[PDB]
Amino acid sequence: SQINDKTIMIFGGSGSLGNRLIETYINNNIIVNYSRDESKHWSMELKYKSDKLKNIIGDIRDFEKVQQSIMRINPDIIIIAAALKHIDRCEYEINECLDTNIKGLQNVLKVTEINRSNLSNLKAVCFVSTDKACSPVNSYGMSKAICETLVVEKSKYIKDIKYVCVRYGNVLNFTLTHTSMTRFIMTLDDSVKLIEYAIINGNSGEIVIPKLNSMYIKDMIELFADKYPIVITGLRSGERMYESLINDTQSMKTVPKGDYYHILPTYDPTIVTEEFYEYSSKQNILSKQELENYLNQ
Template sequence: MFENQRILVTGGTGSWGQELITQLLPRQPKEVIIYSRNESTQVAMSRQFESDLLSFCIGDIRDREALTVACQEVDYIFHLAALKHVPICEEQPYEALKTNVIGTQNVIEAAIENRVKKVIYISTDKAANPSNFYGMTKAIGEKLIVYANLLRSQTQFVTVRGGNVLGTNGSVVHLFMDQIERKKLVNITDMRMTRFFLTLPDAITLLFKASIESVGGEIFIMTMPTCRIVDLAEVLIEASGMEYVSMIETGIRPGEKIHEILMSDYESQTTIVFDDQYLVILPTIDIPYVKKHYSRYPHVSFSSFSSEQNIMTKEEIKDILVRGGFLS
């Protein structure tokens, strides 16, 4: 799919972007363009990869004109750029709106104008029944991406929705490991809290699969494992070998949930089981070829997909941390 193709990655200097590039370059694309705002991270990434296939473009997805120029002769777009931290989006909703909603609209319009083949939008479990502004902006982004398939263009638009990915910037794993080492203290907002987790390499592998299989208009959901945050902290404390590390409950932050969901009750009505790794939410608006394409797949037999279900054991958490390179 990607061989000899020109690919643009918005927000490509982040953790998702770096792993995406790591797995994308062996597929022999013609060119991969990293489109982001920070010149320092672009320079660092350029030195890290030292690949002639990589090029870098300073720009903001809020700037439609600059984005349209960057998309010239591009075949595929991975749209990763977003403001992602829940507290920041709660405190500065105007900025989250401009990046996560208007920026996504700009990506859609730039892709259509340049006849891009496919746009893959990376979403989050927080877009399902959103309780915070970040989730609301990503939910609107999903709706825009679905709707874009009705704009009479040659471009296909698809969403991939996942949960927390271990090792990304600001990951709770990095936070806990730092707190254990420096303070012998782990802050947990609520001892009951659960989350979906997946390693970054696994997330990108699944992302490629959805990119290849999608036809436009659907939302692919990664069926990610779940864990209690307190169990994750205990595994990291045990692995550190340090004695007398304590845990303190600090209280839920604004907009935070005890449990996340990847699929809501409402969405379950139009969701099919694609395979053991993916569910697919079909659009509620009429995109005939999508429903026909997935007509042979069974509908889900459950009404929601919550992080409080199918909790990993501590041994399973340890295994995923080893695979993610956090523990030896």
């Protein structure tokens, strides 16, 4: 609604987030998806049936293909959201996540710098991150955490493009990991709104964070086993018990703005507070009662 008449290029836009972004913006914008699997390209074209949706086959690891594609499109907005789904299998296939996440993003970022003179339209770059990047404890989270610093780094040296990140928890859109596990609650539409908000209202170099309630995963799964038994699988390798969105180091540079928090870039000398805090899914937890009402609505 504040993104209109734009060409939006999305790396990894053939998944859930990508398809929701397309549904949301295709009526008023050109959308270019860049991803590897052309089967999904085919099905997407059949769904939207619009010349305003273009797919490019390519791997974000491939600098040449990334550079050629960005220069062909000359987009106003770039959104980076390419990554694997099952985060835990990064742990013993580490090269695979380093390359897709770190190298992929450094490919896109590099084009915006070295080929800046050929990208007259580019105004904003939005990297989609994850709560797993905050105080990370697994390879996937560590790589995403590095990705954020790379975005912050470009924002320091390249002043005429807005570089922002968003960081969020699990999107909702019988098995139980652990009875103590907590997560933040958010929907696929919340993700999209977060992304637009950051593009429009975030400042270059910021990491923007949504204000979310949280739940015991056990409370949720219990509900589903009544509308519709439960096996308790163990923790996966590298998995933590809770989600953290802001840690005490970041909290000192976090400006709260109602529904969203803006983590100021590290190169900003401003100290917001010395009353440090953590923002995690272990606090402000919905009752089972409250969770039931939310899932219902």
